[PDB]
Structure formats: C-alpha cells, structure tokens
C-alpha cells in the first residue's frame, strides 16, 4: 500500500513533465504492488500505458490499456475513462487495426 500509491503518485507529473523514470519504471521492482485494490492497480496500468505510448507503442501495451479500461468502476467516463478510451485506440491507430 506504499508500494502501491507512491508509484503512480510518483508518475503523475513525470508524465506531465519529462523525467527519465520510464526506464526507471522498467528497472523498478515495485511494478507489482500485489493486488492494489482495483483503483491504484487499475489506473496504474494506464499510467504505465502512456509510458510506452510516448516510448513508441509496438502493440505491447494495448492489452494493458484494454486491461486498465476493463478494470474501471461505475463512476463516469469524464473522470479518466474518456482519456483511456481515447489513447487506447490512438495506439491501435498507430498499429493499423
């Protein structure tokens, strides 16, 4: 639970900014927070999805964009589900399908 929150909370301005922590997030051990309660675990897959988006989607992360979409609750779409619904097939337009 410190393994969980302190990594998306680490991420959210690194994405917003431009730090090198993406390969840091490759070599990070805490890429698993081990069943982080379907909120941090759910959005975490999106926050690591835009990582390989800006580092050149090779069809690797559309399954985890899709996974981040299918792990999201019954709240609304304009929170972030609009944004994952956008980027999720942005990258499929990068593929061709």
């Amino acid at each position: 639970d410190g393994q969980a929150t302190l990594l998306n909370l680490l991420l959210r301005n690194y994405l917003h900014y431009s730090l090198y922590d993406q390969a840091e997030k490759l070599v990070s051990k805490s890429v698993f927070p081990e069943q982080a309660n379907n909120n941090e675990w759910a959005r975490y897959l999106y926050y690591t999805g835009r990582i390989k988006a800006i580092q050149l989607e090779y069809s690797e992360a559309r399954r985890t964009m899709t996974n981040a979409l299918r792990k999201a609750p019954q709240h609304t779409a304009v929170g972030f589900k609009q944004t994952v619904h956008k980027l999720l097939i942005v990258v499929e337009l990068l593929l061709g399908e």
Binding site: S18, Q22, I54, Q55, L56
Partner: protein, 257 residues
C-alpha cells in the same frame, strides 16, 4: 571576474593550443563554483549565463573537431542547464540550433525512441512555429515512409547551418538503404536507372555496390537472383513445437493446479 576567454572564441582556433587552456579553464570554473544549478542566489547568474555560453560554444566546436563522445557530455550538460526552471534566457540565437542539432545528430545515431523522447519539451515549436526544428522532425518523418528524393532535397535544403557531419551520416545510412533497395524483385535494370537513383554519373561506386552485392555488371544488365525458394514446407518444426504445445494443453487440463 575570471574571464580569460573573450579573445579567441569567435575567431577560428580549430584544435589550436587554446583548447587545453579551455578545458583546464573549465576546471578553473569547477574550482570556483559548482555547476550544480545554484538554487539560491538568483542574482548570481555569471556562473550560469556566461559559463553556460562557454559550455555551449565548447559543445559547438566539438563537432568542428568531430569529437563524438565528448559532444554528448557537453550537450548533455547543456540540456541539464535548460532543465532549470530558474528565470534565464528562455532561449537564445542557439537553443533551437543546438537542441535540434542534438535532435539531428541523435537522429543520425539511429536511436528513434530517444528521438521521440526528446520531443517532450518543445510543444508549440513543432509545426505552428520554429521552422528550424520543424525541419528535422519533418525530415525524419520523411525517412519513415519511402520519401527519398525529398530527403535528398532537404539534404542541401538546410536552412539552419552547416549540419554537414550529420547529413553525411545521413548520406550513408541511406546509401546502404538504396544498396538494399536494389535487392528487391526487379527486372533487368540498365546502366542508367539505378546508376542515377543515388547521386552519381558513372564512377566505380556502381562497381563498389555491384561487386559488394549482386545485380552484377553485365550487358547493360543488373542480375535478378530473386529465388526465395528454400524456406517453406516445414512440418517437423511444427511436429516438435506442437508436440510441446499439445502436452502443454494436457498439463492444464487434467492435472490439478
């Protein structure tokens, strides 16, 4: 104010006996004040604007001497200086023609993930303004598809500066690309068409490539060995891999997990 530099920096001293005094002079900058970004004392800029301009001209003649491994040390520390949020020059007469110069050498480095990871600092400067940085990204954008002739138009159609060391790496890394593009299923090409697809009239560079690869020198002839024959009709490699996979089905079918 410990300047020592302001006489032979603009007049050309290409690898003369200025450069060792310049490097130990930068050591004298290190003994005075660290290039740690000096978070306090914002009024003290002489360690930042002046010494940074020293470090970017020291970046600048590094391509003039063609010192590649030190060049990214200089330019990397420059990018670490524009990493600072402290109110500085927002840019200069150099920041486009140096950051995008790093984008153009880095593009010649054939590291495209780093080519796109470096674009997360200058947004609006992409298309809506800053044509001198629009030129490398539209350039490599043309290198993405089969835009070749437009790339060799850009080659020369450089508006910014020389960029010669970069467009010669670019002159090569496309020489092997055409030198592969002859190797597709084509007809007998005469000694004019593929002779003029690059930028040559008749040197023995067509003998360099015609003896390097096939499409051999013939009776106005380039030879097509479009064989592509041997590789199909493999059952045994599926008769091993599928022999793995079917057992892998049987493991997670009856054996309790």
């Amino acid at each position: 104010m410990y300047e020592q530099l302001k006489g032979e920096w603009n007049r050309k001293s290409p690898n003369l006996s200025k450069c060792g005094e310049e490097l130990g002079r930068l050591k004298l900058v290190l003994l005075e004040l660290n290039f740690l970004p000096t978070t306090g004392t914002k009024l003290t800029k002489q360690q930042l604007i002046l010494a940074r301009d020293i470090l970017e001209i020291g970046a600048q003649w590094s391509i003039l001497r063609k010192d590649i491994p030190s060049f990214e040390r200089y330019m990397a520390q420059l990018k670490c200086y524009y990493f600072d949020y402290k109110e500085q020059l927002p840019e200069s007469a150099y920041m486009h023609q140096l950051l995008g110069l790093n984008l153009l050498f880095l593009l010649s480095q054939n590291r495209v993930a780093e080519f796109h990871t470096e674009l997360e600092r200058l947004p609006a400067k992409d298309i809506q303004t800053n044509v001198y940085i629009k030129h490398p990204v539209s350039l490599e954008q043309y290198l993405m598809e089969g835009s070749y002739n437009k790339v060799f138009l850009a080659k020369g159609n450089i508006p910014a500066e020389s960029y010669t060391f970069f467009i010669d790496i670019l002159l090569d890394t496309i020489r092997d690309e055409i030198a592969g593009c002859i190797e597709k299923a084509y007809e007998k090409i005469l000694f004019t068409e593929a002779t003029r697809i690059l930028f040559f009239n008749t040197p023995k560079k067509m003998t360099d490539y015609a003896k390097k690869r096939g499409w051999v020198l013939g009776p106005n002839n380039y030879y097509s060995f479009a064989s592509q024959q041997q590789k199909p009709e493999d059952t045994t490699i599926p008769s091993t891999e599928l022999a793995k996979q079917v057992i892998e089905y049987a493991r997670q079918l009856e054996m309790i997990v």
